[PDB]
Amino acid sequence: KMAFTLADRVTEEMLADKAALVVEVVEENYHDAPIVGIAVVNEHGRFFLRPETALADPQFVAWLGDETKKKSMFDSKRAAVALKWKGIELCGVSFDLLLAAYLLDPAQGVDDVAAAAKMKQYEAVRPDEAVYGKGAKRAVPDEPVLAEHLVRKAAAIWELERPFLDELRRNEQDRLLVELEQPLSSILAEMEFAGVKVDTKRLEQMGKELAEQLGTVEQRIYELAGQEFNINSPKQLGVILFEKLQLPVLKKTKTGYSTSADVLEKLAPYHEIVENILHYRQLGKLQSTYIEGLLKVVRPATKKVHTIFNQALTQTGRLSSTEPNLQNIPIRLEEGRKIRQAFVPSESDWLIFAADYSQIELRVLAHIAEDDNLMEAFRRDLDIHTKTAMDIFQVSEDEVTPNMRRQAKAVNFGIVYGISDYGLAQNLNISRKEAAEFIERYFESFPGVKRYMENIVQEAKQKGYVTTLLHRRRYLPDITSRNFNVRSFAERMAMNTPIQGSAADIIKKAMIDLNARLKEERLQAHLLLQVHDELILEAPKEEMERLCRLVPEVMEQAVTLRVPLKVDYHYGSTWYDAK
DNA sequence: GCGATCAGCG
DNA sequence: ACGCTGATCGCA
Ligand SMILES: [Ca+2]
């Protein structure tokens, strides 16, 4: 029903200087995954190629890697990384429909060509789930069915580039796509393909030691409970805590008693068992998620883990990281932090280098709100999280522990992003009228932040959306909801999204500038990870001193704000040591 | 599959 | 009744 050439060889007219290109990888995780078919649409026609013939053809491989042969694609990072696993370099991607759709409206959740095409009333292509099926029924269809589906996706991309670019231009987002998100896509592909090497001998030794400690704490829990039970059974855990031991019920879930860590900490003065339960869950979390879960995804021949950075998922412009998530590796408790010792350079005599922005969202907020006092604080390089801890806990700077600073950090962000006196009281275990009075004092010191919070909510009501410094956008229809609780969630999104999203814009530009500078200096150093406002690299020992000057400067200069940007950095033998 | 929980980033 | 996430687990 759509005409195309089912090609048995590669011809010259398939290699035009502009084409829509589909390199189809059906498995969710595209690392080392099969490429099941290829479609090309250009001015000369529509073509389907079997991967075994296209990817062994020297003219087609050359065409893929020629940056002056421009390709329009959907999710070009998936294709670029699967091709790297095939030893083939993909260059010249000038349009990525997934990223164009994400910028126009992140809430659409566009996950396939069909969902993006729907945004422009284009429906001559089927959803990928309709073709491959769901779950245990998932399968690559017959070649005639596969070919038409890939050709239809390519024709869709071919037709949709111009109307997507037109709307991007109207939103002031076309340079955001072409100069930020698409260059970042190629850098992430490199980072994902490089992977991070893991010390599996160390990891497995930790897991065995961990398993002994688990049973020890597990027995003490049974003994404190006077009986054995399933510690992870909420119904049995509830019967022990709030029925047998008759502890007060501070919180319910839609399902029953709450047993979250905040509740259990509040119950610590009543019974020693609740702290054993906390230690027990923490150890179990390390065992299940960060020992066993990480060993499951280590590629055995290289001892590398290859995360996937989802670039078109979060509503603020942040990345996310999956299978494994390398953005939530433990750090705060020393027991969990030790897991970072298992993350090691990929070559001997290389080192890990980590650099992160200091108080990034407060500096962005100072700039966007133009609050005189907050701008002055960062022009003085004050540590606002420490200064808030001193105030909260009535201590001196010398006496601020890491824990108090982490707590004050949640107070600072909580307040600027709309925490109530109730939530602040519960978080600080202070009274409610003291919490409300502290919030009032905070906005007396930063009235420009308060004005900003009021203004941004008004602007969202008028426009229907909020934007970031580099013109990312988030629609907030609920901001005019008549339901108070729904409207209130939307208002906090209007306060938070421009700040968190601008911080995401800045680190992304920093990554692009860093990569260009590393190439200009002919360094072997390369990016491994981004963790929202932190960049993690590895490099030969011999490059560390140049990187100590290069990386902070590139990061601090990524944008020019009304206050300085500040970067902290460390390096060491393992990720653990790069702090 | 979903909700609670908890690991991270601000 | 601050925001943005992903993985594991029990299932009230
Ligand atoms: Ca930081």
Q: Where are the domains of chain A?
A: 5-194, 200-302, 334-359+505-572, 361-499
Reference A98, options A201, A8, A188; nearest CA is A188
**Distance, first Cα to last Cα, chain A:** 59
What is the residue whose two structure tokens read 């009543």? Answer: A270
Please check whether residue A98 is in contact with residue A75, taking contact to mean a CB–CB distance below 8 angstroms.
yes
Between helices A182-194 and A76-85, what is the axis angle to 10°?
30
The Å distance, Cα A357 to ligand 1 centre, comes to: 5
One CATH from 3.20.20.70, 3.40.50.1000, 3.40.630.30, 3.30.420.10 for A5-194: 3.30.420.10
Write the secondary structure of A518-549 as one string of H (helix), E (strand) and C (coil). Answer: HHHCCCCCEEEEECCCEEEEEEEHHHHHHHHH
Q: How long is the CA A206 to C1' C10 vector, in angstroms?
A: 26
CA angle A385, A388, A389 (to 5 degrees): 85
**Residue A356 labelled as part of a binding site:** yes
CB atoms within 5 A of ion ligand 1 belong to A 356, 533
CA dist A514 and A184 (Å) reads: 11
Amino acid at A370: E
- How determined? X-ray
CA dist A555 and A533 (Å) reads: 10
**Residue A484 labelled as part of a binding site:** no
| Domain range A200-302, CATH architecture | Up-down Bundle (1.20)
Burial of residue A537, with CB atoms counted within 10 A of its CB: 0-12 exposed, 13-18 middle, 19 or more buried? buried
The Å distance, Cα A199 to ligand 1 centre, comes to: 26
Please check whether residue A250 is in contact with residue A266, taking contact to mean a CB–CB distance below 8 angstroms.
yes
CA dist A466 and A161 (Å) reads: 25
**Residue A303 labelled as part of a binding site:** no
Q: Is the CB of A34 under 7 A from strand B?
A: no
CA dist A491 and A455 (Å) reads: 11
CA dist A137 and A24 (Å) reads: 18
CA dist A511 and A555 (Å) reads: 8
Compute φ and ψ for A197, nearest 5 degrees: -75, 145
Nucleotide lying nearest to A425, CA to C1' measure: C1
Chain centroid to CA A182:
16
One CATH from 3.30.420.610, 3.30.70.370, 3.40.50.1100, 3.90.420.10 for A334-359+505-572: 3.30.70.370
Encoded tokens for A500: 């968190």
Chain centroid to CA A462:
30
DSSP for A78-94 reads HHHHHHHHTT-----EE
Please check whether residue A534 is in contact with residue A321, taking contact to mean a CB–CB distance below 8 angstroms.
no
CA dist A34 and A82 (Å) reads: 8
Between helices A143-170 and A97-104, what is the axis angle to 10°?
40
Q: Resolution of the experimental model in angstroms, please?
A: 2.1
What is the residue whose two structure tokens read 């399968």? Answer: A139
Please check whether residue A109 is in contact with residue A84, taking contact to mean a CB–CB distance below 8 angstroms.
no
Encoded tokens for A28: 């969710």
Q: How long is the CA A197 to C1' B6 vector, in angstroms?
A: 25
**Residue A533 labelled as part of a binding site:** yes
CA dist A49 and A44 (Å) reads: 15
CA pseudo-torsion sign A116, A119, A123, A124? negative
CA dist A497 and A318 (Å) reads: 10
CA dist A196 and A541 (Å) reads: 17
Find out if CATH 1.10.150.20 is the number for domain A361-499: yes
Burial of residue A522, with CB atoms counted within 10 A of its CB: 0-12 exposed, 13-18 middle, 19 or more buried? exposed
Please check whether residue A70 is in contact with residue A17, taking contact to mean a CB–CB distance below 8 angstroms.
yes
CA dist A513 and A507 (Å) reads: 10
Please check whether residue A114 is in contact with residue A125, taking contact to mean a CB–CB distance below 8 angstroms.
yes
Q: Return the number of other C-beta atoms located less than 10 Å from residue A576's C-beta.
A: 18
